[PDB]
Design an enzyme around this catalytic site. Sequence first.
Site, PDB file in Angstrom:
ATOM      1  N   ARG A 132       3.233   6.432  -1.590  1.00 34.58           N
ATOM      2  CA  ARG A 132       3.384   5.449  -0.522  1.00 34.58           C
ATOM      3  C   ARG A 132       4.846   5.121  -0.266  1.00 34.58           C
ATOM      4  NH1 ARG A 132       0.690   0.817   1.872  1.00 34.58           N
ATOM      5  NH2 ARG A 132       2.167  -0.917   2.043  1.00 34.58           N
TER       6      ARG A 132
ATOM      7  N   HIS B 206       1.233 -12.828  -6.630  1.00 35.87           N
ATOM      8  CA  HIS B 206       1.652 -12.140  -5.415  1.00 35.87           C
ATOM      9  C   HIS B 206       2.216 -13.141  -4.412  1.00 35.87           C
ATOM     10  CE1 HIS B 206       1.196 -10.044  -1.525  1.00 35.87           C
ATOM     11  NE2 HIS B 206       1.389  -8.946  -2.234  1.00 35.87           N
TER      12      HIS B 206
ATOM     13  N   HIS C  30      11.558 -13.053   3.611  1.00 41.65           N
ATOM     14  CA  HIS C  30      10.444 -12.381   4.278  1.00 41.65           C
ATOM     15  C   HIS C  30       9.269 -13.337   4.494  1.00 41.65           C
ATOM     16  CE1 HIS C  30       6.926  -9.690   4.520  1.00 41.65           C
ATOM     17  NE2 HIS C  30       7.748  -8.740   4.923  1.00 41.65           N
ATOM     18  N   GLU C  31       8.903 -14.088   3.454  1.00 43.48           N
ATOM     19  CA  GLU C  31       7.764 -14.991   3.561  1.00 43.48           C
ATOM     20  C   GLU C  31       8.100 -16.199   4.421  1.00 43.48           C
ATOM     21  OE1 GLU C  31       4.766 -14.228   2.521  1.00 43.48           O
ATOM     22  OE2 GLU C  31       5.180 -12.540   1.194  1.00 43.48           O
TER      23      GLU C  31
ATOM     24  N   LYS D 141      -1.357  17.177   4.203  1.00 38.86           N
ATOM     25  CA  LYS D 141      -0.261  16.649   3.393  1.00 38.86           C
ATOM     26  C   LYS D 141       0.878  17.653   3.279  1.00 38.86           C
ATOM     27  CE  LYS D 141      -1.155  13.872  -0.084  1.00 38.86           C
ATOM     28  NZ  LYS D 141      -0.418  12.636   0.291  1.00 38.86           N
TER      29      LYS D 141
ATOM     30  N   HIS E 233      -5.595   0.045   0.252  1.00 39.81           N
ATOM     31  CA  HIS E 233      -5.945  -0.268   1.637  1.00 39.81           C
ATOM     32  C   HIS E 233      -7.159   0.510   2.129  1.00 39.81           C
ATOM     33  CE1 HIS E 233      -1.673  -1.259   1.068  1.00 39.81           C
ATOM     34  NE2 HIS E 233      -1.950  -2.288   1.848  1.00 39.81           N
TER      35      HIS E 233
END
Lengths: 201, 596
Positions: B255, B327, B356-357, B463, B487
């Site tokens: 990822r 988290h 960011h938050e 891939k 996800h």
Amino acid sequence: PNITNLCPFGEVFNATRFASVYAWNRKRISNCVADYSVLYNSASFSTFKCYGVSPTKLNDLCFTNVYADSFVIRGDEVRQIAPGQTGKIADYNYKLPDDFTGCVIAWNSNNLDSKVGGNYNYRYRLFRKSNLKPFERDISTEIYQAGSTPCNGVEGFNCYFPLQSYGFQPTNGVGYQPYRVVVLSFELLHAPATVCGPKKS
Amino acid sequence: STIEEQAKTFLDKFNHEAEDLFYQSSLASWNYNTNITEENVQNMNNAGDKWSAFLKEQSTLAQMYPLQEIQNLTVKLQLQALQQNGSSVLSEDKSKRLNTILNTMSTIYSTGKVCNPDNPQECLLLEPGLNEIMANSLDYNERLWAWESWRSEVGKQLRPLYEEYVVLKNEMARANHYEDYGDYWRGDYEVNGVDGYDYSRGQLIEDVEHTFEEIKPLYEHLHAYVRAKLMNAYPSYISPIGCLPAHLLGDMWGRFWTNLYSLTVPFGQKPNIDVTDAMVDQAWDAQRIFKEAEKFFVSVGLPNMTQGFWENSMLTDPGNVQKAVCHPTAWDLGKGDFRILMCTKVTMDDFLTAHHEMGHIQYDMAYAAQPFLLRNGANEGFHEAVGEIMSLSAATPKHLKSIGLLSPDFQEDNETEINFLLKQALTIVGTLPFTYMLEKWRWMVFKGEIPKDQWMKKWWEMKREIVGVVEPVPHDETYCDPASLFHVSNDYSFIRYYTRTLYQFQFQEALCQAAKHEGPLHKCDISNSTEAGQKLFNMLRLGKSEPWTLALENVVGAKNMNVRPLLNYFEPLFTWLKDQNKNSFVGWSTDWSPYA
Ligand SMILES: *[C@@H]1O[C@H](CO)[C@@H](O)[C@H](O)[C@H]1NC(C)=O
Ligand SMILES: *[C@@H]1O[C@H](CO)[C@@H](O)[C@H](O)[C@H]1NC(C)=O
Ligand SMILES: *[C@@H]1O[C@H](CO)[C@@H](O)[C@H](O)[C@H]1NC(C)=O
Ligand SMILES: *[C@@H]1O[C@H](CO)[C@@H](O)[C@H](O)[C@H]1NC(C)=O
Ligand SMILES: *[C@@H]1O[C@H](CO)[C@@H](O)[C@H](O)[C@H]1NC(C)=O
Ligand SMILES: *[C@@H]1O[C@H](CO)[C@@H](O)[C@H](O)[C@H]1NC(C)=O
Ligand SMILES: *[C@@H]1O[C@H](CO)[C@@H](O)[C@H](O)[C@H]1NC(C)=O
């Protein structure tokens, strides 16, 4: 001369419980001395917007009667308590005239009017067929008809119940916190004016 | 009288009733997250069930107002959002089966524990293994063992479940007037009814391919450079002409490539821009971190945090006695309540995470004026992109020098900019082919382009063709290699990361042009610029009321996602990578040349 018999502003501002915005309380204040500088010099009020008269000369003028309207609204709905302003509160709950002489006093009451479970004891009318006239009170609990179909006294499709509750929570934002609003309406009529300010010696 | 007025009254009762039920669900969820106790779990479940049942009843009642007799765009948007059946259109037996399948996949992914054969006395969970072996090991067979064993256990458990999942989701989507579940996911970017700004579900795949075609040279050069460095690290496994081995990318699935920065650093001798020691020396508390972030947001012109934020947020780990999820999460509890749940440490990563938050919180605060059902981002990309732009701006050396965290005599030469850009490329550019390949594979699975017997034969072929990553050993159809990621196994859309990545740099170019920055794009800081904040807040205030195309016109002046700001951001690195790849071969071969 010696001045006594002050007007009962303690029983309006410092009341243990306030009414809802829809069934807003009106108290007629007559035959006493009204000290308005005590209200103006308090630091506890967030809104003291006076329309049609200035706070400095209130303590000098004299009026026939004083109408004290008291209710609880949200923080974001304080702006609608003004002449000309249009909102759910002004259209369906409490309407002020354009030619209004008086003062709108509002303060945050998150400390008293909120609880940790949610205080659902304050209600607002969310629907009505027509807008309210100035200084009108509607306490009817008849089912609002939004559609052609008759409601028949049930909250079915297109038929809603007019009065809704404000969920007051302590952790809520300032916009959604309960604000106690007292509106003082000053009128001068041809009758002898008896609500006068204190006179200096 | 008219249908439109009736819908407006209905969406005047709904907004008020739903805001209250939402704020109770969100409060219960907050109390569970900051306090993991069984009564809190029960309260969360009760509030969630009440919220979901209420949404079901209002969805049942909202469909009775036909869409074609409403002309107001906002009212039609709220009614369109409410009138979605979701899983309700499916039969009760199949709905229960789908819910059971989703829950059991969540348990299998969350509680999947794999350890070495012949030593089974203690095993390793998902979090220990990822943090320790997949990010830090330099051993080929250890990483190969961990990768193959986790895909063996998780894939062999999840393959029949995923086979049932695709059929059930396709049945629900075709019952909801969609072509497949992929069309249902692509419907988030659909704009209908607006003249000129219309966007179709079919246009998303074409736009993603068109942008990726321009992504491909930069990714090819980055792939060649990473391949050469990994060849240095592992001498015989990596081929000069072939793809990269899958288990060597620094993460479990490929990822992100951010864990290869140590191995692939251009200039190791030059220092990094780590400011952790400086905060430790000046005794920076987490409160100071959030106050500095608030100072950054007030500098650009956005509103500062509320009293209820500082009072009700948990910005430090509570302790051993009280357990909380670690988290970092920004919570828009509703009713004017905005909170951040982050176990903030004194690190650069936590400081950037705080930016960011708080960017997420600013985005949530901006659309509070909007109606309840329109209080979201215009698409799924914007909500993350507005936090990532703050993460971009805060990480600049100019911002660190301005706030005092970096020495004023720090030398900014080209080499540090090259290595910083390479780190940003490994995090940002590296995720783009993986994201595009995964979403294209899921779209082909939902569409029926790939038969069930050919899922893996196509997947590895994809891939190799797209990501340039080769399988260590061939996998048959008993494996379920895609579903090992969080996800995909838990029914989440994955194209949000690709769109977020492009929107991030488009917003960054727009705000930097607004702020009159005159240098490279990666050297740009949006602090002290009121006009940049105004340009951002014009889009921020809209929320979901307006199309995402119109919001993008409001910020960047374009009606579509664009790839040129990303390429402009990495242009120094692109020239440097082109210089460094003269001897080596750019591009890969899909053959089994490294290992199979
Ligand atoms: C109301 O309560 C405040 C709070 O102590 C007090 O100071 C004030 O005198 C009271 N009366 C009025 C009329 O405001
Ligand atoms: C966390 O939950 C425990 C469980 O009883 C409770 O006693 C405690 O007050 C909670 N902590 C907070 C901060 O609410
Ligand atoms: C749509 O409805 C909103 C209120 O829900 C109203 O303020 C707005 O002006 C309406 N727009 C049009 C074009 O009628
Ligand atoms: C939702 O499902 C019901 C029941 O089949 C159906 O009548 C309705 O049209 C559906 N709504 C939409 C938007 O497809
Ligand atoms: C936010 O800013 C306003 C105006 O600058 C200020 O009055 C207020 O105290 C600030 N709030 C916080 C929590 O810093
Ligand atoms: C950095 O700048 C110096 C001086 O201009 C130059 O000699 C050197 O090649 C540059 N290095 C890179 C990687 O651009
Ligand atoms: C932004 O403004 C503050 C106060 O006005 C100042 O201290 C700071 O240095 C400014 N930022 C930059 C990059 O100059």
